[PDB]
Ligand SMILES: Cc1cc2nc3c(=O)[nH]c(=O)nc-3n(C[C@H](O)[C@H](O)[C@H](O)COP(=O)(O)O)c2cc1C
């Protein structure tokens with residue numbers, strides 16, 4: 115029917131009652147890849163346009179990594195209304211991830227816990243999948259609909275930095291921006307790459323490889339961090355980011371914390387928690403990183419965004435763009451248009467000429 119209320123109150127609840135989360139996810143990717151979606155309707159206004167990372171974004175709402183892990187539904191996602199698409203978290207070689215079940219719903223908390231473990235088709239498969247639509251994407255990007263590629267590492271890799279280096283060389287030429295994901299809570303020792311010494315070495319290699327690509331194929335490089343960092347960790351990341359000239363940060367992957375108050379029966383499953391319970395922890399992390407980097411480093415805010423208010427709070431905290439995933443798993447496609455519509459209304463209501471004017475607003479009051 116293509117209606118917010120119908121999807122949230124009937125279609126989605128029914129779907130989740132018939133299919134486990136991973137099955138619903140696979141089914142969703144299929145329908146999305148085929149463009150079988152409800153009306154978009156919402157028309158992006160000039161107010162939502164953002165210029166950052168060397169690109170124009172029709173609107174600041176993107177689909178976070180993890181929904182389209184292998185780059186199979188990019189075009190369908192733009193059709194859904196996202197201002198930008200970030201694909202997967204691709205590992206050099208293909209790998210299956212953890213055994214099932216590996217993802218769980220916490221309906222009473224509007225949250226999800228996942229421990230997929232980097233299931234990925236691998237760089238080669240994704241490379242050819244993106245090459246098949248490389249020129250179509252070039253036009254989309256020019257039209258204000260950029261593509262991001264999230265890089266991960268193989269479970270059995272003996273050289274983490276080389277895994278990311280490979281990703282930069284293979285998919286960097288096909289992306290507007292690359293994401294060095296060192297914040298997955300489901301890969302042993304991965305988060306330790308967020309440490310100062312280890313991060314500096316890793317990012318120096320990544321940036322060298324990126325700089326070695328032809329200008330037209332030279333993507334911006336961002337680092338995606340966890341919401342569970344100590345104050346010391348954040349200070350160190352900010353320092354390395356400014357020292358190396360990292361282009362941006364994606365703030366907050368899922369959390370390994372289990373906030374008091376979770377009601378879901380599956381709250382104690384191992385994995386990263388996403389959704390509403392993560393929202394403010396992520397917003398506060400965005401706020402801190404913005405201040406530590408003097409507002410000079412673009413931030414993509416993500417974690418628990420399901421409304422215009424959620425989006426604006428992250429923008430005012432310092433995010434230039436935001437992403438969502440879990441909200442889509444509960445409310446369906448209509449949630450994209452809802453967030454954009456509510457965000458536009460709030461911007462006007464609060465006297466902002468547009469999204470750009472609101473970025474980091476809280477720090478100036
Ligand atoms: C099932 C699932 C799979 C995910 N896979 C990835 C991934 O491969 N790479 C990554 O950087 N983040 C991944 N994420 C994290 C999301 O990109 C995002 O940082 C986090 O879920 C917070 O946003 P949300 O509350 O809107 O879901 C995943 C999240 C979920 C729920």
Ligand SMILES: CC(=O)Nc1ccc(-c2ccc(-c3ccccc3)cc2)cc1C(=O)O
Pocket residue numbers: 129130134135136138139141142145146150151152181217219226442443444446447
């Ligand atoms: C862990 C995870 O990714 N879960 C999920 C991921 C996606 C979805 C989904 C998203 C979009 C539709 C859709 C698409 C086209 C037309 C109409 C509806 C359907 C299902 C549901 C879940 C879920 O847990 O239930």
Ligand SMILES: CCCCCCCCCC[N+](C)(C)[O-]
Pocket residue numbers: 115116129141142145149150151152153
């Ligand atoms: C992904 C399973 C959820 C089932 C709903 C599929 C909705 C079809 C939307 C109809 N349409 C393409 C015409 O807009």
Ligand SMILES: O=C(O)c1cc(=O)[nH]c(=O)[nH]1
Pocket residue numbers: 203228229230231232233295297298299300367368386
């Ligand atoms: O593949 C996964 O398990 C995964 C990766 C990541 O970066 N974040 C997450 O929540 N899950």
